[PDB]
A paper describes a structure:
State 1 was solved at 3.6 Å using 60,601 particles and State 2 was solved at 4.1 Å using 39,368 particles. The well-resolved EM density of the 3.6 Å map in State 1 allowed us to fit, build and refine the atomic model of the hTopo IIα DNA-binding/cleavage domain in complex with DNA and etoposide27. Strikingly, we were also able to identify EM density for the etoposide molecule, intercalating in the DNA duplex between positions −1 and +1, with similar protein and DNA contacts as previously reported in crystallographic structures. This state corresponds to a closed cleavage complex as observed in the structure of the DNA-bound hTopo IIα DNA-binding/cleavage domain crystallized without etoposide, with the exception of the C-gate being closed in our structure. However, analysis of the 3.6 Å EM map of the DNA binding/cleavage domain revealed an additional EM density that could be attributed to the beginning of the CTD domain (residues 1192–1215). This region of the CTD begins at the end of the terminal coiled-coil alpha helix of the DNA binding/cleavage domain on residue 1192, stretches along the Tower domain and extends under the G-segment major groove pointing in an orthogonal direction from the DNA gate. The particular localization of the CTD linker may structurally favor the curvature of the G-segment, stimulating DNA cleavage and favoring strand passage. The portion of the CTD ranging from residue 1192 to residue 1217 is in close vicinity of the G-segment and seems to act as a positive regulator of the strand passage process, which appears to stimulate the relaxation activity and stabilize the cleavage complex in presence of etoposide.
The passage of the T-segment requires ATP hydrolysis and is thought to occur along with the opening and closing of several dimeric interfaces constituting molecular gates. In this work, we determined the cryo-EM structure of the full-length human Topo IIα isoform bound to DNA in different conformations trapped by the anti-cancer drug etoposide.
Residue numbers in the entry:
A (entry chain A), B (entry chain B): 433 to 1097, 1121 to 1215
DNA sequence: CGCGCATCGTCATCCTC
DNA sequence: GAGGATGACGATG
DNA sequence: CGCGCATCGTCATCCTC
DNA sequence: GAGGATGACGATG
């Protein structure tokens, strides 16, 4: 028998014929790994090995409709290549011999995503063939993640904990050239030949023992065990925190030779890392209200001044260059676009100015132009929310031996409450609606004095619909409807989280023609659409209008939309998760966390300004002594000159002293006292240096005199003053667009509420 | 009647109903322009305007199979929306009234590609409905290409010749902020409202008069008028060259108000610009053997040192940042990959080192990994072929007010003859095979003395097949076949321009099973494939083997492949095109063009080294006079100090003098004599300055003494010395891969030639 | 570049009962 | 020997 | 990211005659 | 009033 249906399959020689019990099959993720596998098979052969590339995340089958199972074609190809049958038990070895392939070796990237894909495949095999997991049927191929090189020598490393241990236990570190490997395509032909040469180290077989592992597989993909996953991740996060505090290095895998691998260790040590990473990258933080993807772009934009505009494609390239982004520019351009939209419902405040078309409110925001068609630039509010004097306060990382972005930021407003937070993770998810900036500023000003904060309500910018609060953490939103004449009706505004094209295709189309059980309700509909406002004119029957009035126009046209707030899950200043209940709790927590840092900023700016003033004073004294003629540098050895300078009282660079004092947690230094060009030896510049040092002394005195607080008040005042101009320009943008002569239908407005709260 | 088939269509209100003669339809390219059109229609309305986005280059219908016409679905959608019929004449106004739309307004980018798309649409309409082009049925919408801004003032510009005229005729230039527009998506909502507000300036109607225009349309898309297009472009290129030489500014369009536009002017002024641009971007140059897309990347790589490796995505981002690339990063990543492949048949020499997988010789080179999976870095041969001292020799451009890449480069070898040249343009196309580098070096060394060059033969790197020359500019290539036993046969090497997967699917599959008229010839086939070499073992019938031997194995398995050389078309040092005939002609032309620049390089390096030495001498003299104590700068005004320095004999910066002398085609300057820090006032540094100036004097003396020639010989010697190490590493790469124990079948080889030359 | 299909937890409706 | 058909390739939609 | 289909001039075969 | 079904969303395969 042979296979000729799909061209992508590279069938082996004895596939389906005799000795099929030894014929294996390689499964690779994506299509790049197929190139590595084919390039490698040149050494082993084509008899017992076949390669078939996958597409991406495989459909979960433990809980899915049979129709959806039949819809996927990739699973159908997998069964057609292997030869499995749904209701056929495989107990005897003859049943295994019936199949066309003996073993299945999966190989993917050495990251969390490959681990997730492997878990999905194990679940797929176990859900419908439990007996095949006790005959050595599945196996894994692994690759190195980082290599070193120095004088024709290299050392392979498979796990980061092993690389960290090698760094901590070995001297002469950094002499080797580090080289990170992210994708399988990074390797070359020589590396592939070396990998397939050492089969006893990469090829790893699985092993099954004990029925408990079956529950473990369920523990990973049971839609009825959400709380079980919650506890399973909470215990792991607590253990990791305790181990980090005690300083004991945690355990890893793949270090020495491994003949087999238990499923229990496979799940409780590898997939949980994917779960933790996903929760870290898909849930915002209560401090900066951002995600690591957004944070990298915001840091890269802060690194350069960018006075002019900039293209999005080159911006993403620079972000990948400096922020160490390793998730594909395509997934990053969408995030950059999301950080700039300002239409109704998207964001009450933006950080990137909208130069171009960043998507209207018609096609789900996905109707944006190509990334090379659009331009962008930092808004005036970006550098105001983040004072430039806060870089020294926060802690950074050193991914890829490179000063990289920090873990959070310290704004002057809670960013979670201004731009919302919507994310789906593992075990927990997040859903936080928007609010109004002025109410937040008023509440913070009220709390700073000591008074009690006031209850707030989720609002939006440029929105005219009504919002009603019935139960705590529950809200209802209603749009705008009017009755122009006894026959016509007008829809002016739709509620948030509603798109004009979707609303039209899902409401006007079913109502225009008669459905299977309802007569055609509406008769005519016309659209008067703009970039921001909408206008629907619907003509119907007068009796139908009276009926809708008796029933309620909002219910008929689906204007009342409900929302709840029970997913208030965010990170902490330490890194743990908390289930928040009220917005005032987030406000008080942010207030205290911000209050803790005034002393740190004051203590950092103080001392540093004093040291700069002292350095200027030392430079002035050196210039004055040189003008006096005491210091002679005509033909004097560099060494003797340093010695005579020291006996004066002259010290090293205080900036270097502060850098050393910060880094605590080649001799003397007098370079800056001699790096000044001869231009400094004139009175025209001596006067400027004197006035500059006097200005620095005045600034230091004012800092010593002013309170550690009261800087917050000045910053808020400046922010409000800037927001006034920003909103003025935003309104002028519509005022220029304002046509003037246009249809302007006006009619009595019906405002209604649900008769029954129906509180749970 | 209504339309509900395609969702992308935004139907108007009176479409298909009454007053359809006034209902227009907007056609936009791509999908980004749909966002601009929809955002703009908010002001005009939804009654007489409808938008339908296109996909890209529309299929030409003047010469295409009816089956292919039926295959395209976009044309079917266009007819279904409009309502046209193939064999229905439209003469009376009632026939026009029968249609569902009155007019068609096309809008695209203001570049050459939009012009090409508009021409394709006009051809499509004229080919099957000649009568519709005399009733005001088609129209064009235009947008600005660049804008200026200074103090709430702006001036629109539609053509570059108009912008150049405004720059040349108006003072106070550069005060306005320039802003280039490339894509329609760049504009904002306010700009769209302003565009649709001034309908009398953008909306332009067409006009037809005289049957000659019909021939003009044929002149643009007649597959039987290739020579006519050749003459039509040659006359235009000659006219442009003469106008540039005379300095008279050429004519443009769209400047003042335009009620109509003739087809003759539409074709002889706009589409010809697209033809010229396409020929410029799709044909290599005889000087550097590159194309502008390759040239931009090669310049961007030259700008930075890049000692370490670099990612391809960030590299493309930097190229778009500095090289002013405006054709999409996706089209640029493929070019970057093409500039790095080194497998058999791709390139005899590469400029980017292959770190990763850049595609094997199996899937057409298209099996390369994702651009973020691969790394790259400049090869050691890049900076050797292009000496660093040649940037001053060539002329640059100032696209976007930015120092950008030059027009060509001056290597030490003809790059056209080493990496081939394959391109398809308009009116002309190019096809130049590869050659051997050592033969080129030997021929250049032979020509430099004065001897006669030798005939060469197209060769390839890492190739074992035979090459035969029968007619001039014609060649035949044969692979490698052997007879292992009286039954089996072995194929070792396939000819160039042949892919293993394609050769297998197009030869082994038809031969394995019996075709409609042939019995199954082969019986068994097995593959022993590697990354570089191939091995096919085919088992067949002994009688069939004798029959194939009687007929010829090369003919049976398609091993002999012919190639011709009649498309030797390249640019010139001036910019014109020439139809070359022999390779020796290209070699002699390159030799003379290179010989012309030795004097220029010598004259540039001379004088410049002398000026640097003079500047060092002036600095040393100033330091010596200061040590003597004659020059006093204690408390002296900046102005009086300059005056006393001048009376000494001290001059300005000679580097500035050379920069001014080059730029020919605020007073005194003594900054560098005072920008030296105090460290220079010690003997330890005075000795170093003295030795440095002595070294500069020696270098200048050697330059004055050596011949203007003989630098070419030293550069060639260094290049050969480096190529020795490069080839040694390349061979070692296979030697490490060399498995050792493997199947090594050896058999008698049959070498054959066509019995009849069959010369034309 | 556009549509192609996938995870993962809450939930607002949506179709039966 | 003598004519029509067609895909091959590369920068861009 | 993979396959989706298009131009444009020469030409090596490829299927009839 | 009471239960199962399902798509909605966003960073990534
Ligand atoms: C096809 O070959 C591979 C594909 C992938 C996936 C992928 C997989 C898909 C799929 C699409 C995609 C696609 O994502 C899409 O991007 C789109 C970009 O425009 C925006 C508007 O909309 C996005 C889609 O929301 C998203 O779904 C790829 C982007 O980069 C990836 O990593 C994605 O539809 C079918 O299955 C991974 C691979 O190996 C690692 C592959 O070999
Ligand atoms: C769909 O929406 C639009 C598409 C386009 C075209 C395009 C058009 C296509 C089409 C594909 C393409 C595609 O090219 C493809 O890229 C591929 C990239 O990977 C490599 C391996 O292979 C390339 C294909 O050889 C090439 O054909 C686009 C890339 O950027 C463009 O400019 C291309 O197949 C169907 O018609 C322009 C638009 O507006 C301006 C659009 O709105």
């Amino acid at each position: 028998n042979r296979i000729k249906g799909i061209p992508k399959l590279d069938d082996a020689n004895d596939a389906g014929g005799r000795n099929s019990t030894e014929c294996t099959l390689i499964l690779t993720e994506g299509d790049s790994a197929k190139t590595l596998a084919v390039s490698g098979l040149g050494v082993v052969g084509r008899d017992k090995y076949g390669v078939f590339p996958l597409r991406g995340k495989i459909l979960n089958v433990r809980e899915a409709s049979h129709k959806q199972i039949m819809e996927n074609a990739e699973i159908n190809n997998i069964i057609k290549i292997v030869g499995l049958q749904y209701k056929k038990n495989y107990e005897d070895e003859d049943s295994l011999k019936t199949l066309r392939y003996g073993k299945i070796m999966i190989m993917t990237d050495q990251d969390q995503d490959g681990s997730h894909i492997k878990g999905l495949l194990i679940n797929f095999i176990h859900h419908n063939w439990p007996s095949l997991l006790r005959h050595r049927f599945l196996e894994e191929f692994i690759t190195p993640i980082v290599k070193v090189s120095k004088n024709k020598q290299e050392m392979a490393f498979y796990s980061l904990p092993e690389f960290e241990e090698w760094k901590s236990s070995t001297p002469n570190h950094k002499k080797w050239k580090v080289k990170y490997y992210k994708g399988l395509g990074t390797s070359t032909s020589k590396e592939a030949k070396e990998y397939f040469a050492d089969m006893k180290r990469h090829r790893i077989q699985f092993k099954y023992s004990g029925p408990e592992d079956d529950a473990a597989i369920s523990l990973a993909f049971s839609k009825k065990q959400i709380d079980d996953r919650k506890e399973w991740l909470t215990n792991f996060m607590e253990d990791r925190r305790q181990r980090k505090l005690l300083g004991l290095p945690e355990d890893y895998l793949y270090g020495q030779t491994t003949t087999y691998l238990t499923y229990n260790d496979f799940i409780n040590k590898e997939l949980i890392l994917f779960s933790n990473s996903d929760n870290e990258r898909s849930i915002p933080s209560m401090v900066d209200g951002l995600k690591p993807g957004q944070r990298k772009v915001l840091f890269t934009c802060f690194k350069r001044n960018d006075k002019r505009e900039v293209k999005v494609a080159q911006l993403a390239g620079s972000v990948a260059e400096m922020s160490s982004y390793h998730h594909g520019e395509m997934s990053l351009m969408m995030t950059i676009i999301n950080l700039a939209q300002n239409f109704v419902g998207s964001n009450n405040l933006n950080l990137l100015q909208p130069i171009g078309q960043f998507g209207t409110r018609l096609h789900g925001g996905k109707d944006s132009a190509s990334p090379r068609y659009i331009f962008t630039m930092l808004s005036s509010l970006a550098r105001l929310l983040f004072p430039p004097k806060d870089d020294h306060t926060l802690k950074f990382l050193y991914d890829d031996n490179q000063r990289v972005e920090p873990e959070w930021y310290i704004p002057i407003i809670p960013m979670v409450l201004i731009n919302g937070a919507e994310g789906i993770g593992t075990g927990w998810s997040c859903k936080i609606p928007n609010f109004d900036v002025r109410e937040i500023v008023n509440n913070i000003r009220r709390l700073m004095d000591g008074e009690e904060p006031l209850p707030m309500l989720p609002s939006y910018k440029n929105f005219k619909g009504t919002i009603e609060e019935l139960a705590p953490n529950q809200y209802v939103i209603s749009g705008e409807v009017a009755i122009l004449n006894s026959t016509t009706i007008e829809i002016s505004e739709l509620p948030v989280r509603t798109w004009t094209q979707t609303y039209k295709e899902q409401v006007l189309e079913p109502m225009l023609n008669g459905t299977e059980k309802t007569p055609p309700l509406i008769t005519d509909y016309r659209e008067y659409h703009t970039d921001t406002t909408v206008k629907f004119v619907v003509k119907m029957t007068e009796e139908k209008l009276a009926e809708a009035e008796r029933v309620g126009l909002h219910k008929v046209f689906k204007l009342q939309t409900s929302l709840t707030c029970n997913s208030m899950v965010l990170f902490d200043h330490v890194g743990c998760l908390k289930k928040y209940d009220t917005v005032l709790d987030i406000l008080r927590d942010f207030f205290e966390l911000r209050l803790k840092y005034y002393g740190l900023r004051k203590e950092w700016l103080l001392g540093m300004l004093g040291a700069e003033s002292a350095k200027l004073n030392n430079q002035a004294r050196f210039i004055l002594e040189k003008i006096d003629g005491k210091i002679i540098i005509e033909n004097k050895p560099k060494k003797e000159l340093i010695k005579v300078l020291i006996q004066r009282g002259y010290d090293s660079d205080p900036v270097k002293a502060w850098k050393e004092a910060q880094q605590k947690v080649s001799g003397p230094t007098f370079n800056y006292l001699l790096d000044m060009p001869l231009w400094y030896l004139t009175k025209e510049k001596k006067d400027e240096l004197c006035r500059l040092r006097n200005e620095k002394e005045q600034e230091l005195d004012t800092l010593k005199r002013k309170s550690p607080s009261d800087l917050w008040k000045e910053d808020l005042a400046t922010f409000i003053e800037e927001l006034e101009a920003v909103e003025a320009k935003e309104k002028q943008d519509e005022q220029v667009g304002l046509p003037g002569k246009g249809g302007k239908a006006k009619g009595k407005k019906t405002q209604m509420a649900e008769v029954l709260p129906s509180p749970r």
